[PDB]
């Protein structure tokens, strides 16, 4: 039998902010994947967001690059961010799939540009961010901002947001970009 | 190399869709907490990606 075959390879981490772990291995690499089947028998096998303890995240970077703004992949870049403030279990578990999906997939012509996605789960408020290599680059920022807008239930309401790395890096968040 | 939601839903009801992950040994000690669905047997909780897809069409 022969897998559909993905344009990248994909790394999935959990973070669990778990103190039995020291902070420098708390970003746990689980594995990687290049076929569509690999990546849905990891899907059928991990729980979905909703489902995973406070303070973590998972994250889906492509090959070799980590989950941290300060990464050499990241540095120049950004975030799309979306914040689900009252956001149901179902809708919540559906936007990361739909996310997962754009990026596996290779749904944006900007495809390049892409890096990975992180979502934040958190009691308060959750959030899903959609991290891009060059934060000047507004061309592909923009025309990746519209795929997702147009490819996730995605609303008026919850915002995508737009941020620099250079930005978040420092002390709420300033953004470069609002759709 | 790209594929749509459509092939992307198609291809989650694969039988390869469902066996476990090939790092599943590795994993078991990485991140225990995280791991679900260890009976292959029962497919109760799946991902169904035709009820999925037909979801998505409901919304359109």
């Not at chain 1, 970077?61 to 179902?90: C, H, Y």
């Not at chain 1, 009691?123 to 807008?149: F, M, P, Q, V």
């Not at chain 1, 996730?152 to 250079?166: D, T």
Request: hydrophobic share 35%.
């Amino acid at each position: 039998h022969m897998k559909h075959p993905l344009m990248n390879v994909w790394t999935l981490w959990y973070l669990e902010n778990d103190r039995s772990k020291s902070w420098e291995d708390m970003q746990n690499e689980i594995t990687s994947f290049d076929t569509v089947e690999d990546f849905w028998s990891l899907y059928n096998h991990i729980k979905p967001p909703s489902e995973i303890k406070l303070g973590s995240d998972y994250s889906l970077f492509k090959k070799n690059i980590r989950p941290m703004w300060e990464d050499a992949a990241n540095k120049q870049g950004g975030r799309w961010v979306i914040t689900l403030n009252k956001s149901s279990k179902t809708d919540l578990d559906n936007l990361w799939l739909d996310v997962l999906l754009c990026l596996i997939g290779e749904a944006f012509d900007h495809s390049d540009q892409i890096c990975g996605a992180v979502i934040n789960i958190r009691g308060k408020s959750n959030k899903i961010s959609i991290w891009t290599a060059d934060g000047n680059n507004e061309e592909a920022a923009l025309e990746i901002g519209h795929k997702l807008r147009d490819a996730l239930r995605l609303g008026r309401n919850n915002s995508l947001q737009y941020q620099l790395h250079k930005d978040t890096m420092v002390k709420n968040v300033k953004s470069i970009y609002t759709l | 190399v790209s594929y749509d939601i459509e092939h992307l839903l198609y291809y989650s009801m694969s039988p390869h869709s469902w066996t476990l992950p090939t790092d599943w040994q590795k994993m078991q000690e990485t991140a225990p907490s995280i791991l679900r669905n260890k009976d292959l047997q029962d497919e109760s909780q799946r991902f169904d990606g035709d009820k999925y897809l037909a979801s998505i069409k409901t919304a359109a």
